[PDB]
Amino acid sequence: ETLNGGITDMLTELANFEKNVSQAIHKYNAYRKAASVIAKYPHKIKSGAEAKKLPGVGTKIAEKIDEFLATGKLRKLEKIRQDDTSSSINFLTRVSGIGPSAARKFVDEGIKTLEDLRKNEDKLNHHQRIGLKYFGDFEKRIPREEMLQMQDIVLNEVKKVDSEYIATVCGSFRRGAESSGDMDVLLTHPSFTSESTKQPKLLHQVVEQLQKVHFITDTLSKGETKFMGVCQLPSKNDEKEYPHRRIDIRLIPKDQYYCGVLYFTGSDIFNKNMRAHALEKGFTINEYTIRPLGVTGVAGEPLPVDSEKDIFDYIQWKYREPKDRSE
Template sequence: HPKRDQLLTKTQQLGLKYLEEFEQKIPREEMTQMETILVREITAIDDQLKAEIVGSYRRGAKASSDIDVLVTHSSATKLPSLLHKIVDILTKKVQFVTDTISIGDSKFMGVCQLDSSKLHRRIDIRVFPSEQYHCALLYFTGNDQLNRHMRIVAQEQGYKLNEYSIQKVGSTGVL
């Protein structure tokens, strides 16, 4: 409906467009196929890149509600155009990404589809410098309850833990 579309944001329009597909869980087998494509295409850009699906998939779940991907480079500390390059390849070269919700220097939110016979799925790709990757891996593997518990334990011992670093409270350096 054209008038309704003018009132909705792009994110809302995509949410409505794919609502029934997004409500269905992604079977682990499909996630594994997606991981193969993502790792192949991302490491083809630079063999020093590492890509990993995190969240419930990394925790071993049989199904997931979306795909969360972490990317890092073994030596680069600044990766300004990397995410745009990854999304461009996943969109144009392999037609895996079908829609972009938002994209910045380090976070992409969008829609992907394994092939035309499969459902559209929500995908988030986050790029982290190598010195932040392990904290990001821990944080984005989760789950939320574990993350809260780890932050409390860290705080009790005088540390601050988040997806970027673990630091002694009051310190500016990363451990």
């Protein structure tokens, strides 16, 4: 956790690079298990040889660790942190809509920057375009003080369209958190579930409303059960307009809300622990359901949940307020 920190860090840099710049999924993946294992490792790695001793730890990595341990640096890391091409790719990638793949193409065409991008808006697709338009706004965290305003809006409009809708804003927003990265809304309705054959309107109706009133500004992606967009808290009495924010809306069959809801609320750490306990308690849990574990090895059969309560209860645990859902 700090005893093999550098090592794990460099290793991650390395891993990252393989995958983003070179295409080296293998390699990339190589650095990963490597960092994972050293990461758990209980002692002060004092040399390569020592490390090699670990699994996932081969000769090349060991080499690397030596140099790094031998000197505060590593040539290769040295070379990569410079290289404009490598740099460019890490940057282009910041645009929502541009992945590594794309980042590669673009550079090989000479687009290496923001201006490059504006100049070549033609080559970008709609998502990518938006991404570019809101480059700044998108990188700006979302303060709770805004979150609550947003939330206040979304829930009121959902309410109007149908009393039966049920919306929840998961995320750390839900776990307390002072600011957040984007707004995540879990959606359901009684008239939609597991078996119930579809109802796309269910999602589209709301989406519309939200744009009705202009809370929703652009559509990133809009499918039948997942909508990816851009919203914005109306600028008050003109002088201070708000940054454009990412927002997602997703339909969930009622029969599987809370697991989902539980799930999205995190933290990842909370999940796992709960997850493992469920396991002890003779259970199974994932995104959509909680199942009674048979002994034969495995087994299923969706236990029935009416709230986040039903779940814990099942695994016979202490109901946890979202705030304490931390780890």
